[PDB]
Design a binder for this molecule. Sequence first.
Ligand SMILES: Nc1ncnc2c1ncn2[C@@H]1O[C@H](COP(=O)(O)OP(=O)(O)O)[C@@H](O)[C@H]1O
Ligand SMILES: [Mg+2]
Length: 255
Amino acid sequence: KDNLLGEANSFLEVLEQVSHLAPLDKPVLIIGERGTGKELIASRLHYLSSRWQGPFISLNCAALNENLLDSELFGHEAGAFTGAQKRHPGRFERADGGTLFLDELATAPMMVQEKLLRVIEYGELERVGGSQPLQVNVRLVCATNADLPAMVNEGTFRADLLDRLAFDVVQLPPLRERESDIMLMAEYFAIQMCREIKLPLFPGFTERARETLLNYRWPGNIRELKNVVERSVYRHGTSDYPLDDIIIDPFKRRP
DNA sequence: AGACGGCTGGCACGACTTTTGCAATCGCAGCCCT
Ligand SMILES: Nc1ncnc2c1ncn2[C@@H]1O[C@H](COP(=O)(O)OP(=O)(O)O)[C@@H](O)[C@H]1O
Ligand SMILES: [Mg+2]
């Protein structure tokens, strides 16, 4: 499919579950830490999914405000629209039969929440008069980094609607918990950045870098992975000289 | 007897008017161009 970061037993099982869900057009949930890219994984699995070649929706959550699905997802394609009349494309109508991914869906308001709840209850929220229904055939996807478990417990979203929006919630475990893909990512990023930073060679994570990583809590995980990647890009040293002090923390004050 | 008067209107600038000067996107689908 695509070049992938992480082939661990957990990562491999994730790939297997992705294959299982790929036929499953029923909406599901892939949970994980941000700065990893589970959305890209969803895109690859969608290429493997029912829509082997189909549409795709990015749909960052807080990209629409005071803009209903009717404003953007449904659109104003027909005549007699607001202002002077013309054609206007709509997302949720545009990408039927493809992929419908919701980015940072945990970042959500109550009103859009009530909208999407009915959209799920009816297949799509539809437009205008209450006599008009709709359904969307795109592969519905969504993800964020928040444990909604308490958000619904706090009522930030409708708990029943939360239950409705998916059919199988899956959570990506911490890469820091893995801490084995540490070396694999280090090497892959070393090659990629040697191609990028145009270095003579990859310095290689010397003993101190490995020890620090072993001690590192790595809160950002894949986010912290790219963070350490940039950090070592700062701490290049020499292409020959293996990087023992590879990490570079911006917050710290040297000397 | 040359200067006032008041007429006159030209000279000018803002305030009410006011004609005109603007036509389309839909709707399939079929027929025509490819
Ligand atoms: N398996 C992977 N292979 C290559 N790159 C990855 C992998 N997982 C994560 N990444 C990197 O992490 C980033 C995650 O981006 P994105 O999915 O947009 O985050 P979010 O879903 O929080 O917006 C991507 O830019 C990608 O380069
Ligand atoms: Mg994103």
